[PDB]
Amino acid sequence: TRVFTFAGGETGVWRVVAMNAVAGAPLPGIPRLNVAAGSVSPQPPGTKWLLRGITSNERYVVREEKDRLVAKQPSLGRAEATCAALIPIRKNPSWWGLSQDERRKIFEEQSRHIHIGLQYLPAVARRLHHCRDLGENEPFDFLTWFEYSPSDETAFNRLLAELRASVEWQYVDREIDIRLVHEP
Amino acid sequence: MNTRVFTFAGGETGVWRVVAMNAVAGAPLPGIPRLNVAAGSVSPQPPGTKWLLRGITSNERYVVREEKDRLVAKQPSLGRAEATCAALIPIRKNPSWWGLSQDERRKIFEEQSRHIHIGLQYLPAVARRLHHCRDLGENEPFDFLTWFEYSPSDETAFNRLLAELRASVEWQYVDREIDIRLVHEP
Numbered sequence: 001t002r003v004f005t006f007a008g009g010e011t012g013v014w015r016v017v018a019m020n021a022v023a024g025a026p027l028p029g030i031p032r033l034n035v036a037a038g039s040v041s042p043q044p045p046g047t048k049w050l051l052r053g054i055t056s057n058e059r060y061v062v063r064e065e066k067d068r069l070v071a072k073q074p075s076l077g078r079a080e081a082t083c084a085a086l087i088p089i090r091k092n093p094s095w096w097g098l099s100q101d102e103r104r105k106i107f108e109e110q111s112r113h114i115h116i117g118l119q120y121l122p123a124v125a126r127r128l129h130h131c132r133d134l135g136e137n138e139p140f141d142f143l144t145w146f147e148y149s150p151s152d153e154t155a156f157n158r159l160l161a162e163l164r165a166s167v168e169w170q171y172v173d174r175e176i177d178i179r180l181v182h183e184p
Numbered sequence: 185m186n187t188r189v190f191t192f193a194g195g196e197t198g199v200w201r202v203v204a205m206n207a208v209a210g211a212p213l214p215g216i217p218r219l220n221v222a223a224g225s226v227s228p229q230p231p232g233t234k235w236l237l238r239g240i241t242s243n244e245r246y247v248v249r250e251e252k253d254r255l256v257a258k259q260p261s262l263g264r265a266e267a268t269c270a271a272l273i274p275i276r277k278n279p280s281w282w283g284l285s286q287d288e289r290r291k292i293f294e295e296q297s298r299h300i301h302i303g304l305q306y307l308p309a310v311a312r313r314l315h316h317c318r319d320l321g322e323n324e325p326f327d328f329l330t331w332f333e334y335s336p337s338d339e340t341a342f343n344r345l346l347a348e349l350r351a352s353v354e355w356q357y358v359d360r361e362i363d364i365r366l367v368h369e370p
């Protein structure tokens with residue numbers, strides 16, 4: 001399955017414990033989050049908002065980087081990773097008009113995104129969802145999903161601080177940081 | 185509406201008359217007499233439609249600044265009055281392609297296949313638009329909808345371009361290709 005839909009509302013297995021608009025306009029506060037797989041999923045009862053994205057092919061990663069990620073990255077769904085974060089991100093529109101080399105330079109050569117992220121594995125599990133090429137309008141360009149143990153929360157926060165200080169983050173115009181704890 | 189999404193509606197309606205449907209690789213689409221290029225998503229299917237193909241224009245995945253600047257200078261506008269021929273060429277690439285890393289695909293696409301280098305040789309004759317399908321969902325029949333416009337005097341040239349690209353390393357990964365030729369109504 002490539003398509004995932006994140007429903008914020010009154011029902012779901014993830015309890016929302018924090019929501020902050022890091023950049024741009026806030027999203028409505030909600031108590032629970034549900035994640036559904038596939039292209040024809042139902043809207044859960046009591047849904048306030050729905051965000052959809054699709055996993056996709058690599059846009060920047062080179063083979064040598066891929067091999068490092070494969071060696072180090074954890075799986076989604078670990079028993080002990082009871083904390084999660086959903087971080088919807090929208091880029092500045094100018095980003096999308098840049099050429100491929102220009103974006104790769106900002107992303108990795110300047111911002112060191114992968115290099116930094118690698119330093120937080122195996123603590124942090126991740127999944128990247130793309131929104132901008134779906135058939136239907138989405139308010140964000142990416143839905144980023146993370147999972148980690150409670151004891152790794154401060155490491156996750158440090159990762160975010162490092163990325164938010166990067167050149168790449170100058171191009172982030174909306175970013176919502178939603179923190180979750182899995183239901184018992 | 186989003187200015188990036190288009191639906192190609194094969195059927196009994198539209199400004200484009202279908203003159204040929206070439207089954208280049210893999211199974212063809214049902215024969216159609218006309219083509220409509222609609223903004224956005226189409227539902228329900230208009231009377232007379234046999235099929236709908238949707239795609240979205242998107243950001244560059246491979247081109248570098250030096251290439252882009254060449255393209256911007258040389259490429260013609262879409263919608264030129266004299267460019268009464270068009271081609272709609274749906275393309276699918278195989279699963280192996282999509283699992284390759286970015287450097288591997290860029291190497292195939294340009295360093296080996298010379299896609300852009302070749303295509304530049306056919307500007308300003310040929311106007312083009314690339315539409316992406318694979319991030320609409322897992323169940324689109326093609327990965328790309330490619331659209332071209334040219335004058336009838338440039339049709340032989342366009343055919344030469346196609347033969348060059350179809351001989352390239354990149355095309356080793358193409359597992360479906362249909363080539364539909366159109367002429368604009370008067």
Ligand code: HEM
Pocket residue numbers: 057058059060061069087089107113114116117118120124125126128142144159160163168286
């Ligand atoms: C946990 C460690 C992390 C690692 C190893 C990592 C790795 C990566 C990799 C490999 C890509 C490129 C994918 C491609 O080639 O298409 C990527 C893209 C991306 N990542 Fe991360 N990442 C991490 C954390 C984060 C965090 C915490 C955020 C959000 C706050 C984030 C936001 C993004 C975005 C928005 C993209 C899309 C490309 C772009 O930057 O324009 N990543 N990441």
Ligand code: HEM
Pocket residue numbers: 100243244245246247255273275299300302303304306307310311312314328330332345346349
């Ligand atoms: C007329 C001259 C042509 C030029 C200048 C040209 C140029 C380009 C450029 C710059 C890209 C890369 C876009 C990016 O960075 O995302 C591209 C992609 C593509 N072109 Fe062409 N092209 C031409 C003709 C054709 C023809 C005739 C076909 C089909 C038979 C074709 C099929 C494609 C496909 C399928 C892609 C997507 C590649 C992928 O993302 O894997 N092109 N072209």
Ligand SMILES: [Cl-]
Pocket residue numbers: 059
């Ligand atoms: Cl991207």
Ligand code: NA
Pocket residue numbers: 130131132
């Ligand atoms: Na994207």
Ligand code: NA
Pocket residue numbers: 054130131132133134319320
């Ligand atoms: Na997308």
Ligand code: NA
Pocket residue numbers: 240241242243314315316
């Ligand atoms: Na495009």
Ligand code: NA
Pocket residue numbers: 242243244245314
């Ligand atoms: Na593109």
Ligand code: NA
Pocket residue numbers: 245
């Ligand atoms: Na692509």
Ligand code: NA
Pocket residue numbers: 245289
């Ligand atoms: Na590609």
